[PDB]
UniProtKB/Swiss-Prot annotation, chain A:
Species whose genome carries this gene: Human herpesvirus 6B (strain Z29) (HHV-6 variant B)
Family matches, as InterPro entries: Herpes_1
Top-level division of the source organism's lineage: Viruses
Keyword Amino-acid biosynthesis set for record: no
Stated role: Structural component of the T=16 icosahedral capsid. The capsid is composed of pentamers and hexamers of major capsid protein/MCP, which are linked together by heterotrimers called triplexes. These triplexes are formed by a single molecule of triplex protein 1/TRX1 and two copies of triplex protein 2/TRX2. Additionally, TRX1 is required for efficient transport of TRX2 to the nucleus, which is the site of capsid assembly.
Keyword Iron belongs to the record: no
GO biological process: one example: viral capsid assembly
Protein name: Triplex capsid protein 1
Curated annotation (Swiss-Prot), chain B:
From-to range in the entire protein, with total length: 2 to 49 of 1345
Similarity comment: Belongs to the herpesviridae major capsid protein family.
Top-level lineage group: Viruses
Species classification: Viruses, Duplodnaviria, Heunggongvirae, Peploviricota, Herviviricetes
Compartments, as annotated in UniProt: Virion; Host nucleus
General function of this protein: Self-assembles to form an icosahedral capsid with a T=16 symmetry, about 200 nm in diameter, and consisting of 150 hexons and 12 pentons (total of 162 capsomers). Hexons form the edges and faces of the capsid and are each composed of six MCP molecules. In contrast, one penton is found at each of the 12 vertices. Eleven of the pentons are MCP pentamers, while the last vertex is occupied by the portal complex.
Oligomer and partners: Homomultimer. Makes the hexons and eleven out of twelve pentons. Interacts with triplex proteins 1/TRX1 and 2/TRX2; adjacent capsomers are linked together in groups of three by triplexes, heterotrimeric complexes composed of one molecule of TRX1 and two molecules of TRX2. Interacts with scaffold protein; this interaction allows efficient MCP transport to the host nucleus. Interacts with capsid vertex component 2/CVC2. Interacts with the small capsomere-interacting protein/SCP.
The protein's name in its UniProt record: Major capsid protein
Swiss-Prot record, chain D:
Organism: Human herpesvirus 6B (strain Z29) (HHV-6 variant B)
Top-level taxon in the UniProt lineage: Viruses
Gene for this chain: TRX2
Quaternary structure note: Interacts with TRX1 and major capisd protein/MCP.
InterPro entries with a match to the protein in the record: Herpes_capsid_2
GO MF entries: structural molecule activity
Protein name: Triplex capsid protein 2
Alphabetized UniProt keyword annotations: Capsid protein, Host nucleus, Virion
């Protein structure tokens, strides 16, 4: 039909290109001194030039990951600790959105009831006794493969789409509905949006309270995004101007923005999570190419 | 004009004694119509 | 029990160009360098 | 697909298609992000009829999506969307020497333009933004912010006396100038945060630094130090001398204050610092085409 | 794309063993150029022959990072990193790598006890230190503090305050910053940086006060009185030589703002520290770590 034949030719070309990236031709002469299992393995001879996603295996005590052992795809945070044992300790996004100040009291106490044990209480006391937040805890990546052992194993994706293996049921970032906002002239402007995470502090006369925002925007340029964010955040910025000079705690800014990665506009869908019956409204990004940039601070 | 005609159409070989000092001639602009490209240029495949 | 009966699907009906009666207005010709054509034109020479 | 096809709506001429054969390998921005483009969204002319403000063109040019010209067949026009960190060949349009190794930004075209030679076809032009080094990009942005700070000072003929001295700059044996800045309100917000951060540098500047001026003047002597003394002697709206500079056990407070001062300087730098779009490796001897390894 | 480096002199067997110890390391390279001599390899052609710490931070930002891959009989295979892909780095610096850390390149500290990993006939090999970003900020601030207080005299606590500056600690690994008493071994002298910082902190109040006179009476509300407070709190007693002042030969104010914005893009090198590597996993015993490359 002078159309479908060229179509099938392009299909076979992409299939054979995947096979070229996956398997390697062997030029070892193969003298025939082998058993059939080693035969078929030396004929196939995989390599891992196929997945193209960057993961990290992770050990974390199972007390902290209370609903996040059930719903794959969550932001994870590294919390270095002055104890020499678990020098690093890994923190849920919702676990730190507990004492974020953006979250209303109902959602805060609901996920606190999802987050009440002794280990969590001690870790939250550690986080509060830390002076600032953003460089004693840190952004780490996206959850996939909860194991739930004794000390549970987590895979975590640094770059690429979020999937364990076999490229099935490619998970998505799950953001709490309260903690995000899209400062833009028009929400969902033309096409795929970059997702950023903003840490913003606040000072209610005693101490510092941190706040966790997620912005979704068509702007790629970090200068444009911090220019729209000062426009959004100018009030508490002036309050901080009052605060940072009388303060003696070693911090130097109002907040910091960092890129998570790409999303898709038609792949934003609403929903809720539930753990022990606690319905909690979330906005689920579906397919994400995780692209971490540097932290960019703004005062 | 006609530069892709030069670079595509079949040509007539010439004496190497004639093609001698081309570099300095092209540099000091002895000719009036010249087009020189340093890299391998795909400007001769976009036929319109 | 909880039976599921037969599973049904649609037939996408198929559209040839020349079956539709817009092709009586049309006149369709393949020309493998129409991507490379800049401008086709026709000339009419009228006398009064 | 990684290929955007432009198709012009208006017809063209053979001199025009020869000009487009000359203009190959130039970065052209598109807003559309579709697999097809047309002549309406190609280039920067669909925005440079709205108020012609250089800051406005610069902001929306930051918003634009850049592509590279390739393979002009017929009326069609391929634009490759160039991938991150890969190598691409760029023909240059900025009147500059283009020394290798430096970073590049993408700047609005300077409005000294004479003869839309590349194109002008049926109430449509091909407004191509220039590519420049980041140093002169920051230089232009310093000029913009400074004209904000001076056009604040409402005058008659002093505006002209400042602008005709300021605007013509020379970087690497090339004179450029940018005319007709009506100094809209959008520059005022961009400059307000500079004013704020300079106020915080004032407030959080430690006792070591303003003392370090006078200590360096008393200990050593050099030409930079002479010009800095000329600045400090010429300006006299400040004098708030703090008498005691002993710094007994002040070390962690000094570290905290200097960290804050550095962060304010980083903020004001992030005001005028434009995003590096290209990194040059190999340059032709003409300085007409050069290779880069980058995308933002 | 890879790069072959051919050495200039002969090599000892102990030198070949040093290369086999250091078969994975970052090396900066000036020219994106395929065949490079060892006279142009490394950072010692730039440090200890040129300007000190400001030019060094700028050039270390602008050079081509490139990691060692494999050593042949006498040649070095150097692979340059592609963005968005992983690479692998061996642990030269003292500070322990951990997972999920951002990494950057600082210029090396002035250590003559470092054993100058190769010292091949008046040429030596110097590497930048791969270091976490929080340390890079802390080292930058400690270095600037040493360079600021080293010029001051007649402090009777000067030795102990320089020692309390030089001693930094991070995850139980101590180091002493070698910018002690001004030994001048490699002070890096940071004089342009310190002059630029202090011109910012001196010229800023005058420029902001001039701006504070005009374009504020109704709409510059959040700006004016907030700047009155920032200026007022610290500089509570300003304008002591005034009364023959508060003028502007508007070209003069023009020169003020132009110079004070010049100094900021001069101190652009101390502005940011980009994340050259994001380490994902770390091998056992902290010998090397597999990272990903960015910027």
């Amino acid at each position: 039909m002078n159309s479908k034949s060229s179509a099938r030719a392009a299909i076979v070309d992409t299939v054979e290109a995947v096979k070229k990236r996956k398997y390697i031709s062997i030029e070892a002469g193969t003298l025939n001194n082998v058993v059939e299992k080693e035969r078929k393995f030396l004929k196939q001879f995989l390599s891992g030039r196929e997945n193209l996603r960057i993961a990290a295996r992770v050990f974390t005590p199972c007390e902290l990951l209370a609903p996040e052992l059930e719903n794959l795809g969550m932001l994870m945070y590294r919390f270095e600790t002055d104890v020499d044992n678990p020098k690093i300790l890994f923190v849920g996004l919702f676990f730190l959105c507990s004492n974020a100040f953006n979250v209303s009291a109902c959602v805060r106490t609901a996920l606190t009831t999802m987050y009440t044990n002794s280990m969590v209480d001690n870790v939250l006391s550690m986080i509060n006794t830390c002076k600032y937040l953003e460089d004693k805890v840190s952004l780490f990546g996206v959850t996939s493969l909860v194991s739930c052992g004794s000390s549970c194993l987590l895979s975590c994706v640094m770059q690429g789409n979020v999937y364990d293996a076999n490229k099935e049921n490619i998970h998505g970032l799950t953001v709490l509905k309260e903690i995000f906002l899209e400062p833009d002239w028009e929400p969902r402007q033309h096409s795929t949006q970059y997702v950023y995470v903003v840490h913003v502090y606040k000072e209610v006369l005693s101490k510092l309270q941190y706040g966790i925002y997620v912005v979704l925007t068509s702007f790629q340029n970090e200068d444009l995004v911090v220019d729209i964010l000062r426009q959004y955040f100018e009030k508490e910025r002036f309050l901080f101007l009052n605060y940072l000079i009388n303060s003696n705690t070693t911090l130097s800014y109002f907040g910091s923005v960092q890129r998570i990665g790409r999303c898709a506009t038609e792949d934003i869908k609403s929903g809720f999570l539930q753990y022990r019956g606690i319905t909690l409204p979330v906005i689920k990004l579906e397919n994400i190419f995780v692209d971490l940039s540097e932290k960019k601070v703004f005062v | 004009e006609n530069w892709q005609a030069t670079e595509i159409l079949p040509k007539i070989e010439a004496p190497l004694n004639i093609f001698n000092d081309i570099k300095t001639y092209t540099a000091e602009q002895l000719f009036d119509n010249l087009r020189i490209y340093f890299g391998d240029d795909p400007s001769r495949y976009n036929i319109s | 029990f909880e039976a599921l009966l037969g599973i049904y699907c649609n037939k996408i009906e198929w559209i040839n160009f020349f079956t539709t009666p817009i092709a009586v207005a049309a006149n369709v010709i393949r020309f493998n360098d129409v991507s490379r054509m800049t401008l086709g034109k026709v000339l009419f020479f009228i006398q009064l | 697909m990684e290929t955007v096809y432009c198709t012009f709506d208006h017809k063209l001429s053979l001199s025009d298609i020869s000009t487009l054969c000359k203009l190959m390998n130039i970065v052209i921005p598109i807003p559309a992000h579709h697999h097809l483009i047309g002549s309406g969204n190609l280039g920067l002319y669909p925005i440079v009829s709205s108020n012609k403000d250089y800051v406005h063109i610069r902001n929306v040019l930051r918003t634009m999506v850049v592509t590279i010209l390739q393979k002009v067949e017929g009326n069609q026009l391929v634009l490759r969307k160039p991938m991150t960190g890969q190598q691409y060949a760029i023909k240059n349009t900025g009147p500059f020497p283009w020394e290798k190794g430096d970073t590049l930004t993408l700047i609005p075209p300077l409005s000294t333009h004479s003869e839309e030679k590349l194109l002008k076809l049926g109430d449509w032009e091909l407004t191509v933004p220039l590519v420049v080094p980041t140093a002169i990009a920051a230089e232009i942005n310093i000029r913009l912010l400074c004209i904000g700070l001076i056009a604040v000072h409402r005058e008659y003929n002093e505006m002209q006396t400042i602008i005709d001295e300021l605007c013509s700059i020379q970087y690497r044996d090339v004179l450029i100038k940018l005319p007709d800045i009506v100094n809209d309100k959008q520059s005022m917000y961009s400059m307000k945060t500079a004013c704020i951060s300079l106020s915080m540098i004032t407030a959080m500047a430690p006792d070591i630094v303003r003392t370090y001026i006078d200590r360096l003047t008393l200990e050593d002597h050099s030409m930079l130090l002479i010009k800095c003394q000329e600045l400090l002697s010429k300006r006299t709206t400040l004098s708030t001398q703090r008498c005691g500079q002993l710094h007994a056990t002040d070390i962690k407070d000094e570290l905290k204050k200097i960290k804050s001062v550095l962060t304010m300087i980083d903020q004001i730098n992030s005001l005028t610092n434009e995003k590096t779009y290209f990194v040059v490796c190999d340059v032709s001897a003409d300085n007409r085409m050069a290779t880069c390894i980058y995308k933002n």
